[PDB]
Amino acid sequence: AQLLAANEQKFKFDPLFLRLFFRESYPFTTEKVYLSQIPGLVNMALYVSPIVSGEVIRSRGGSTSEFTPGYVKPKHEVNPQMTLRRLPDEDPQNLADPAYRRRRIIMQNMRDEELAIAQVEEMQAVSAVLKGKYTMTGEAFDPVEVDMGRSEENNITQSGGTEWSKRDKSTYDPTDDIEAYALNASGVVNIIVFDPKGWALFRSFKAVKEKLDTRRGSNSELETAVKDLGKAVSYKGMYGDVAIVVYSGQYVENGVKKNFLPDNTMVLGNTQARGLRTYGCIQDADAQREGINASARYPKNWVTTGDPAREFTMIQSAPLMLLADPDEFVSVQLA
Amino acid sequence: AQLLAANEQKFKFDPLFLRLFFRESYPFTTEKVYLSQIPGLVNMALYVSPIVSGEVIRSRGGSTSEFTPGYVKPKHEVNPQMTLRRLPDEDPQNLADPAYRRRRIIMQNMRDEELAIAQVEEMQAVSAVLKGKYTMTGEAFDPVEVDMGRSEENNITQSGGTEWSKRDKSTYDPTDDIEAYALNASGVVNIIVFDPKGWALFRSFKAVKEKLDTRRGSNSELETAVKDLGKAVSYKGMYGDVAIVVYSGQYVENGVKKNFLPDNTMVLGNTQARGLRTYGCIQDADAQREGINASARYPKNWVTTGDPAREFTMIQSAPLMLLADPDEFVSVQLA
Amino acid sequence: AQLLAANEQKFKFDPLFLRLFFRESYPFTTEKVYLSQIPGLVNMALYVSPIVSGEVIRSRGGSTSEFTPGYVKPKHEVNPQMTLRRLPDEDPQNLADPAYRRRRIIMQNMRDEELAIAQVEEMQAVSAVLKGKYTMTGEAFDPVEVDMGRSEENNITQSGGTEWSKRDKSTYDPTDDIEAYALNASGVVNIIVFDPKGWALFRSFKAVKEKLDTRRGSNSELETAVKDLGKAVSYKGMYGDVAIVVYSGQYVENGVKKNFLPDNTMVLGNTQARGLRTYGCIQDADAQREGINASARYPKNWVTTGDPAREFTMIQSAPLMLLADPDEFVSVQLA
Amino acid sequence: AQLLAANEQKFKFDPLFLRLFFRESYPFTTEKVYLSQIPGLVNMALYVSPIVSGEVIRSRGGSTSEFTPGYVKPKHEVNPQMTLRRLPDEDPQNLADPAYRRRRIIMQNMRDEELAIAQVEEMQAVSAVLKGKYTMTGEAFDPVEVDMGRSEENNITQSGGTEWSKRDKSTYDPTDDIEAYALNASGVVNIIVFDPKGWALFRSFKAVKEKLDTRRGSNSELETAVKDLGKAVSYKGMYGDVAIVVYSGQYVENGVKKNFLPDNTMVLGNTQARGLRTYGCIQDADAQREGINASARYPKNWVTTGDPAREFTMIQSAPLMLLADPDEFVSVQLA
């Protein structure tokens, strides 16, 4: 089999949601997840007298600090009969050799599984911060639930009483509503991510159009993040002070492609949230043997024999995408 | 006779279907096509507990997996009498040289080849997503049928009771019908590309002409494909949760021109639908001598004697365009 | 006289009707034009057996292929007695040199004369696409008609029925007319070039002025060439998916300026429509000595004797501007 | 322990007040602070005939001097159970070394307290321009009052018969009121920074927005100073010759957050009001041995034994934020 040095990818293609909010990462050197080792938040400076005395600042993790990592393994085989993807500038001559055949099919595999698992971290992250509730299920795996701690005030539903659809599209101005929903944000909002369907009814108001900024985009280096993964990510401009973005992310279910977000559901928050990327240990003999259990991903390959006389490649991971303050976002359930 | 390295075209102008749905390309080293050897989709990551070895991710093959490749292979003469388009001020002195003249004309002939063989791919693709049913038959070749796997739910007719022509252009709203049609689409729908005439009656609906968003700065990099194929693709604007495109493309048979699409039709579809570009082996006696059996196209310069004492240039290929999920679209014929 | 190589102009300033639609040039070595010699159209494909050899495909499509090239030859004398535009700070004493001044005026004489033949090409193009016929008559030259093949269903007059004049400029939407004239286009329309006063009444329409996307630097790249020769061409901007421009240039007759277009006229065209820049031959024995019988423009310098005791400079060329499709554009007589 | 020179911070993160009002800094070489040692302001010329030497100008400044600064001092442990944040593209090979990990942890700590220290002089300035009174209290602190010399008209609250909340939200013009507030400013008013909840009331008047120039780019230098504080500060627009800022930064007490400003409050001043940044001696026996008694901050690292057997990192300073003219700002408590 190919050795562990066969990890030559160094590509950062996380679709817009591991990049805007959870920029950091905290691998663990323990099987569970403890918030005690999390640095947490800074505190005051505590006015005190001169050198007469002095006391130590000690940072707690709160009360609940136990979590179960979302450990998972995708498996692939290296059957040297699979049809190779017709990449451009690819000579069939140096493809006839089975040596290149194998080393390319294994790598194409490698990519498709981190793509799948990356879809998975994004799915769990959006599940966590879409309403503050979060869950962990799967066949051949015990069901697990996790409470982020979101306040009831940050899950407003538009359907109740005053919707957005049955108002006048020419006079009803949504600045009042967006400000009334951004006041209870525990922080000034600057990212106003929309959904492909919900954006239409929001933009339908003509009062929106004129005030909208569209001159090339003038927010920040966020444009660089947007134009890279521009397929499911669309950028319009400025709402006068804040960024207007529509996310149309997709994930592959058993056999159906499904949107990342429910249609008429909006997210409101900051561009600099504090989001956790905790990981569990790599519960296997070899990684412990090289002591690399504290990592995001683990590739490894072998040839197993006897009943399955075939060769297999694994990726192991254990995410628990987490947010420090669930209340720096509000979920608008539009209708 | 000129060598096999006379294939310098680098023209990537597939007309709107190989580039939007059929981004996935696959040659074979075998005569026929075997559906089992396509890697297929990648499922989510389905979760497993870290106590048991996981389940092997395998591409599940369908009931029918063996079809007949679409061998098509035209040629042309290279009589050094053909006129030349005047390249701008590249030393017209060499135009007198027949050696440079034939060398110039061969690229033009091969470009004619490429544009001619592009059309068979797109007429196969349009048949695929208009019916999921495909017939490849012609003179000096046996009839061939490919049943892609479409269901009847994706071929509903506007003539089934109430028709848009048999409605009111002023008060009736066709949107509800649009979501009704997209219901049995087996996934996300964001392109409902119309016919050149099939939209003129659609736009007559009053609700349409304000609900459509004709403003620029539209959905995504999608519109760049419009700037490439600017001869037959118009982008009418945004319809909310879906884009609107009108395609007036035409293919040219022996002497006359014909539209690709019927007069009143539309398709319920996704921009992420995966399309297969499988290519059969080059059944050329020479080709096997160089191990070039696996490719997309195949040129050759050759000299004929005795009865047709001229020399020719040849292009051979075998497109058998296929779709992963035929039922991802819904073909509504309008009335 | 001067060397024949003294032709250093290379400052192509074709007035937007040779750089928009007539990018393709086709000089001949035959004194007449043979339209069947131009490649033109080539048909789709055939389904052939992989074994039996396919038949050669020929290049037909043109039946009438005979026309008379547009020969014109202006000329000028070189007497060193004119008044010269004193360029900034280059000639302290060089103005005294007769040869230097002679070469300067010869260069200036050329720079002056190419404008005349540019005007001829421009009127050829506009006479082609404003009414679909062509007439070619000049004193000391025979009259001759050129038939493009334009159908009358591209020469609709707005006066027919209810024109824009007896129409509301605040409530009525002229777009309905726009598609009411764009259906018979044989290709997607994105050029709607207007006349100054013709667009003036068009601009009066309200629906235009809220739909007129005037924002500069549009996604269209035609304006990159527009600012070059902007002396007589404006750029209105976008009208959704289409590009609106106004042209108001004038050709100089023997003593005055004259607008190319009749006041109330407008056009419908596609951004990449194919137009022919075919040129006739140089029926000059002196030119034919060097085998320059196939060229674009031909200079000459030579000293006259006996009756007009002077020195002359010849510029001779035979443009016979043609189109791939005569009915592709639609010319509507505004009202 | 670590050397004192290990002070690799180089970060300028002053929260909107030390970076705009208190640019000048004046450390003290004595334990207490004497206000009378500020440089002060200078008279006109003392016009004099050029025959006799004049009197020497001496600037003293203020009368009261005997103030005493607060002596906060954060101290922290470096217990190597710290789960290090996984730096991107960092090799886990260095993760093995305890020394590298310890150095990383201490550098993370230094940032931790440098965020912990900025807040105290932040609300020092907040209290400075809120009423001009400054009370500093706390356990083991001997609370001290500080009188900056403010008048009462600098603290007018809108509490009369008519308030911004209980009048017309359409016809009332807030200008006359804002100049009524800014007339007694002892200078040109330039900053009208808002508390977001108060701004919610302010923007309710439309007469704001038909004159609100919220163009991107405040003055081309304010954004050069405020973009770094992307979490707490926001810039609205121009009210003509003046700027509008909304600040919602929060200082966190032992367990919860709290906003710096009182909710329905706003303040008026100028961008050039000079503010003192006086600091005091660092009463560290080591500091006297290294001659650094006069400084802003002081790092330290040492290894204790026996009772708290650990090793600790230490910071201590003496902030007594001051403004030259307390009356240069007026505080309106909105209602």
Short mmCIF file of C-alpha atoms in Angstrom, two decimals, chain C residues 16-314:
data_model
loop_
_atom_site.label_atom_id
_atom_site.label_comp_id
_atom_site.label_asym_id
_atom_site.label_seq_id
_atom_site.Cartn_x
_atom_site.Cartn_y
_atom_site.Cartn_z
CA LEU C 16 -17.59 50.49 -36.19
CA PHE C 17 -19.17 48.88 -39.26
CA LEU C 18 -15.98 47.03 -40.21
CA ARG C 19 -14.88 46.11 -36.67
CA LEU C 20 -18.29 44.90 -35.41
CA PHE C 21 -19.82 42.79 -38.18
CA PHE C 22 -17.18 42.48 -40.91
CA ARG C 23 -14.24 41.05 -38.97
CA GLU C 24 -13.80 38.52 -41.77
CA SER C 25 -11.87 39.52 -44.90
CA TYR C 26 -11.49 37.58 -48.17
CA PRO C 27 -9.30 39.09 -50.90
CA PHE C 28 -9.31 37.35 -54.28
CA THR C 29 -6.82 36.75 -57.06
CA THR C 30 -9.71 36.82 -59.56
CA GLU C 31 -11.05 40.04 -61.02
CA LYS C 32 -14.60 39.09 -60.02
CA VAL C 33 -16.14 37.63 -56.85
CA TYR C 34 -17.07 33.95 -56.53
CA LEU C 35 -19.28 33.58 -53.45
CA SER C 36 -19.22 29.79 -53.82
CA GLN C 37 -15.47 29.99 -53.14
CA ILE C 38 -16.02 31.28 -49.58
CA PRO C 39 -16.38 28.34 -47.13
CA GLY C 40 -19.70 29.38 -45.64
CA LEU C 41 -21.80 26.70 -43.95
CA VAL C 42 -20.98 23.03 -43.32
CA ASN C 43 -23.54 20.42 -42.32
CA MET C 44 -23.98 18.46 -39.09
CA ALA C 45 -22.97 14.77 -39.24
CA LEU C 46 -23.97 11.24 -40.26
CA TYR C 47 -24.35 7.92 -38.42
CA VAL C 48 -21.97 5.56 -40.19
CA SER C 49 -20.76 2.02 -39.63
CA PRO C 50 -17.29 1.74 -38.05
CA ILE C 51 -16.15 -0.50 -40.92
CA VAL C 52 -17.42 0.89 -44.22
CA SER C 53 -15.63 4.04 -45.35
CA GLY C 54 -17.75 7.18 -45.33
CA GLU C 55 -18.37 9.46 -48.28
CA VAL C 56 -16.61 12.78 -48.78
CA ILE C 57 -18.61 15.88 -47.84
CA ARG C 58 -18.34 18.76 -50.31
CA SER C 59 -18.82 22.50 -49.69
CA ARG C 60 -21.99 23.85 -51.31
CA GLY C 61 -24.58 26.38 -50.19
CA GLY C 62 -24.04 29.23 -52.63
CA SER C 63 -25.88 29.21 -55.95
CA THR C 64 -25.65 32.85 -57.09
CA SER C 65 -22.01 33.81 -56.62
CA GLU C 66 -21.35 36.55 -59.19
CA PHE C 67 -20.97 40.27 -58.47
CA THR C 68 -18.81 43.20 -59.57
CA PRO C 69 -16.12 44.39 -57.11
CA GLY C 70 -16.29 47.97 -55.89
CA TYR C 71 -13.25 49.51 -57.54
CA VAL C 72 -12.30 53.02 -56.42
CA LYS C 73 -8.98 54.80 -56.93
CA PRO C 74 -8.39 58.25 -55.42
CA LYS C 75 -5.18 60.14 -56.05
CA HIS C 76 -3.35 63.30 -55.04
CA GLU C 77 -0.49 65.59 -56.04
CA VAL C 78 2.52 66.48 -53.92
CA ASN C 79 3.30 70.15 -54.57
CA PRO C 80 5.26 71.63 -51.62
CA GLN C 81 3.23 74.81 -51.19
CA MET C 82 0.49 73.92 -48.68
CA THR C 83 0.19 75.06 -45.07
CA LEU C 84 1.22 72.39 -42.59
CA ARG C 85 0.01 71.68 -39.06
CA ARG C 86 3.06 72.66 -37.00
CA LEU C 87 3.56 69.72 -34.66
CA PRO C 88 4.78 70.63 -31.16
CA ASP C 89 8.53 71.27 -31.04
CA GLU C 90 10.22 69.08 -33.64
CA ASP C 91 11.18 71.41 -36.53
CA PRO C 92 13.45 74.32 -35.53
CA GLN C 93 15.13 74.34 -38.93
CA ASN C 94 13.91 71.09 -40.52
CA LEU C 95 11.03 73.10 -41.99
CA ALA C 96 13.59 74.51 -44.44
CA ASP C 97 14.33 71.08 -45.93
CA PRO C 98 12.20 70.55 -49.06
CA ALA C 99 12.55 66.75 -49.00
CA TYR C 100 11.55 66.51 -45.34
CA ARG C 101 8.47 68.66 -45.96
CA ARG C 102 7.65 66.63 -49.08
CA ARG C 103 7.76 63.34 -47.19
CA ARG C 104 5.69 64.88 -44.39
CA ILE C 105 2.96 66.03 -46.78
CA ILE C 106 3.01 62.68 -48.61
CA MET C 107 2.40 60.96 -45.28
CA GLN C 108 -0.29 63.54 -44.49
CA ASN C 109 -1.78 63.08 -47.97
CA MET C 110 -2.09 59.34 -47.36
CA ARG C 111 -3.53 59.85 -43.86
CA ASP C 112 -6.09 62.13 -45.50
CA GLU C 113 -7.00 59.79 -48.35
CA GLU C 114 -7.65 56.57 -46.43
CA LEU C 115 -10.68 58.30 -44.87
CA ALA C 116 -12.34 58.47 -48.30
CA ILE C 117 -12.18 54.70 -48.94
CA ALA C 118 -13.17 54.09 -45.33
CA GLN C 119 -16.28 56.14 -46.10
CA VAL C 120 -16.93 53.93 -49.14
CA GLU C 121 -16.71 50.77 -47.05
CA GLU C 122 -18.99 52.32 -44.44
CA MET C 123 -21.66 53.22 -46.99
CA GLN C 124 -21.37 49.72 -48.43
CA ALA C 125 -22.07 48.25 -44.99
CA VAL C 126 -24.92 50.62 -44.14
CA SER C 127 -26.54 50.24 -47.56
CA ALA C 128 -26.32 46.50 -46.94
CA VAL C 129 -27.96 46.54 -43.52
CA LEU C 130 -30.51 49.26 -43.66
CA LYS C 131 -32.55 48.01 -46.63
CA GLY C 132 -30.93 44.74 -47.73
CA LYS C 133 -30.10 45.73 -51.31
CA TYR C 134 -26.98 47.41 -52.67
CA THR C 135 -26.48 49.92 -55.48
CA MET C 136 -23.07 50.86 -56.88
CA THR C 137 -22.88 53.76 -59.32
CA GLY C 138 -20.29 56.44 -59.95
CA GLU C 139 -19.39 58.88 -62.67
CA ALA C 140 -16.96 57.38 -65.19
CA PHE C 141 -18.22 54.00 -63.93
CA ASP C 142 -21.14 51.73 -64.72
CA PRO C 143 -24.20 51.37 -62.45
CA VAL C 144 -24.69 47.89 -60.98
CA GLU C 145 -27.04 46.35 -58.41
CA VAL C 146 -26.12 43.78 -55.75
CA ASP C 147 -28.79 41.50 -54.26
CA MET C 148 -28.12 40.37 -50.70
CA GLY C 149 -31.21 38.18 -50.45
CA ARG C 150 -32.84 40.21 -47.69
CA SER C 151 -36.49 39.40 -47.10
CA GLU C 152 -39.01 42.21 -46.74
CA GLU C 153 -40.04 40.95 -43.29
CA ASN C 154 -36.96 42.72 -41.91
CA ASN C 155 -37.93 46.13 -43.33
CA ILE C 156 -41.05 46.85 -41.27
CA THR C 157 -42.06 50.50 -40.87
CA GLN C 158 -43.21 51.70 -37.45
CA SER C 159 -45.72 53.91 -39.28
CA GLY C 160 -47.54 50.69 -40.16
CA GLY C 161 -50.44 50.62 -37.73
CA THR C 162 -49.90 52.42 -34.42
CA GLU C 163 -46.43 53.96 -34.36
CA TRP C 164 -44.49 55.22 -31.36
CA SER C 165 -45.31 58.83 -32.26
CA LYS C 166 -49.05 58.57 -31.48
CA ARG C 167 -48.21 56.65 -28.32
CA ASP C 168 -47.76 57.49 -24.66
CA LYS C 169 -44.23 58.26 -23.50
CA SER C 170 -45.03 57.58 -19.83
CA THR C 171 -47.25 54.48 -19.62
CA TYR C 172 -46.76 52.45 -22.80
CA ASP C 173 -43.98 49.86 -22.86
CA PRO C 174 -42.10 49.76 -26.20
CA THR C 175 -40.59 46.40 -25.22
CA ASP C 176 -43.70 44.64 -26.52
CA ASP C 177 -42.79 46.08 -29.92
CA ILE C 178 -39.16 45.06 -29.36
CA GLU C 179 -40.00 41.36 -29.20
CA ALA C 180 -42.78 42.02 -31.72
CA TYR C 181 -39.94 42.79 -34.14
CA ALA C 182 -37.26 40.47 -32.73
CA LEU C 183 -39.16 37.22 -33.32
CA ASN C 184 -38.21 37.20 -37.03
CA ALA C 185 -34.52 37.72 -36.30
CA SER C 186 -32.84 34.36 -37.13
CA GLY C 187 -30.63 34.72 -34.08
CA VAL C 188 -30.62 36.38 -30.67
CA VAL C 189 -30.72 40.17 -30.85
CA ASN C 190 -28.39 42.29 -28.74
CA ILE C 191 -27.67 45.31 -31.00
CA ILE C 192 -30.44 47.91 -31.24
CA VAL C 193 -28.35 50.80 -32.66
CA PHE C 194 -30.52 53.90 -33.05
CA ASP C 195 -30.32 57.24 -34.82
CA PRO C 196 -29.95 60.45 -32.79
CA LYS C 197 -33.44 61.83 -33.36
CA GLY C 198 -34.83 58.31 -33.68
CA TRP C 199 -33.58 57.49 -30.19
CA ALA C 200 -34.64 60.94 -28.93
CA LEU C 201 -38.32 60.02 -29.17
CA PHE C 202 -37.42 56.54 -27.92
CA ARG C 203 -35.72 58.03 -24.85
CA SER C 204 -38.91 59.97 -24.14
CA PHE C 205 -40.55 56.66 -23.21
CA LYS C 206 -40.71 56.28 -19.43
CA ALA C 207 -40.49 52.48 -19.37
CA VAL C 208 -37.18 52.80 -21.19
CA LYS C 209 -35.84 55.32 -18.70
CA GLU C 210 -36.46 53.09 -15.71
CA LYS C 211 -35.35 50.02 -17.68
CA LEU C 212 -32.32 51.76 -19.25
CA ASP C 213 -29.32 50.30 -17.40
CA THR C 214 -27.03 53.24 -18.11
CA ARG C 215 -24.27 52.20 -15.63
CA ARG C 216 -20.89 52.48 -17.33
CA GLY C 217 -18.36 49.70 -17.83
CA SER C 218 -21.02 47.15 -18.77
CA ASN C 219 -20.34 43.44 -19.08
CA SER C 220 -20.46 43.99 -22.84
CA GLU C 221 -16.99 44.61 -24.26
CA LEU C 222 -18.04 46.56 -27.37
CA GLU C 223 -17.47 49.92 -25.65
CA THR C 224 -13.75 49.09 -25.56
CA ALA C 225 -13.78 49.80 -29.30
CA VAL C 226 -16.41 52.56 -29.01
CA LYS C 227 -14.27 55.05 -27.07
CA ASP C 228 -11.70 54.77 -29.87
CA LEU C 229 -13.99 56.22 -32.55
CA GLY C 230 -16.35 58.06 -30.24
CA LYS C 231 -16.31 61.22 -32.36
CA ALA C 232 -19.66 60.23 -33.89
CA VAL C 233 -20.83 57.24 -31.82
CA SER C 234 -22.44 57.41 -28.39
CA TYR C 235 -23.08 54.48 -26.03
CA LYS C 236 -26.47 54.42 -24.32
CA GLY C 237 -25.73 51.23 -22.42
CA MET C 238 -27.76 48.18 -21.43
CA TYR C 239 -31.47 47.43 -21.85
CA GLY C 240 -31.42 44.22 -19.84
CA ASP C 241 -29.91 41.39 -21.86
CA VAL C 242 -29.42 43.64 -24.88
CA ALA C 243 -27.01 46.47 -25.73
CA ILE C 244 -28.31 49.84 -26.94
CA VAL C 245 -26.09 52.29 -28.84
CA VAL C 246 -26.79 55.39 -30.96
CA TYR C 247 -24.87 56.21 -34.15
CA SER C 248 -24.92 59.69 -35.69
CA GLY C 249 -21.93 59.77 -38.04
CA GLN C 250 -21.82 61.64 -41.34
CA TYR C 251 -20.12 60.97 -44.65
CA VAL C 252 -18.73 64.00 -46.47
CA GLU C 253 -20.13 64.43 -49.97
CA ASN C 254 -18.43 66.80 -52.41
CA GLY C 255 -19.18 69.81 -50.23
CA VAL C 256 -21.23 68.98 -47.13
CA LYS C 257 -21.83 66.35 -44.45
CA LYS C 258 -24.67 63.82 -44.74
CA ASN C 259 -26.10 61.39 -42.21
CA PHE C 260 -25.69 57.71 -43.08
CA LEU C 261 -29.09 56.72 -41.80
CA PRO C 262 -32.55 58.11 -42.52
CA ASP C 263 -33.79 59.84 -39.40
CA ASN C 264 -36.37 57.31 -38.14
CA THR C 265 -34.50 54.03 -38.59
CA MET C 266 -33.26 51.33 -36.24
CA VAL C 267 -31.55 47.94 -36.52
CA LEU C 268 -31.63 44.49 -34.91
CA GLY C 269 -28.43 42.44 -34.99
CA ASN C 270 -26.28 39.90 -33.16
CA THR C 271 -22.91 40.66 -31.59
CA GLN C 272 -20.99 38.10 -33.68
CA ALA C 273 -22.85 38.13 -37.00
CA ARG C 274 -20.54 37.15 -39.84
CA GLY C 275 -19.89 39.76 -42.51
CA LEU C 276 -17.58 39.57 -45.51
CA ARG C 277 -14.77 42.02 -46.19
CA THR C 278 -14.06 40.61 -49.64
CA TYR C 279 -11.90 42.79 -51.89
CA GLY C 280 -11.46 42.80 -55.65
CA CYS C 281 -8.15 42.70 -57.52
CA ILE C 282 -5.68 45.40 -58.54
CA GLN C 283 -6.02 45.53 -62.33
CA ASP C 284 -2.77 47.45 -62.60
CA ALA C 285 0.00 45.99 -64.74
CA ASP C 286 2.61 47.78 -62.65
CA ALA C 287 1.01 46.28 -59.55
CA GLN C 288 0.78 42.89 -61.27
CA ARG C 289 4.54 42.99 -61.88
CA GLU C 290 5.18 42.23 -58.19
CA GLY C 291 2.34 39.71 -57.90
CA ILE C 292 0.31 41.92 -55.57
CA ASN C 293 -2.86 41.26 -57.54
CA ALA C 294 -4.51 39.97 -54.34
CA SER C 295 -4.31 42.66 -51.67
CA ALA C 296 -6.36 45.16 -49.70
CA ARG C 297 -4.96 48.58 -50.65
CA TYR C 298 -2.39 49.60 -53.26
CA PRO C 299 -0.21 52.71 -53.11
CA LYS C 300 1.72 54.32 -55.95
CA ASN C 301 3.96 57.36 -56.43
CA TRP C 302 4.97 58.59 -59.88
CA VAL C 303 5.83 61.80 -61.75
CA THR C 304 3.50 63.08 -64.47
CA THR C 305 4.68 64.66 -67.73
CA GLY C 306 3.36 66.85 -70.54
CA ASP C 307 -0.19 68.04 -69.90
CA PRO C 308 -0.51 67.94 -66.08
CA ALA C 309 3.15 68.55 -65.27
CA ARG C 310 2.97 67.37 -61.66
CA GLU C 311 3.52 64.29 -59.52
CA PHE C 312 0.74 61.93 -58.50
CA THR C 313 0.09 59.36 -55.80
CA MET C 314 -2.40 56.54 -56.42
#
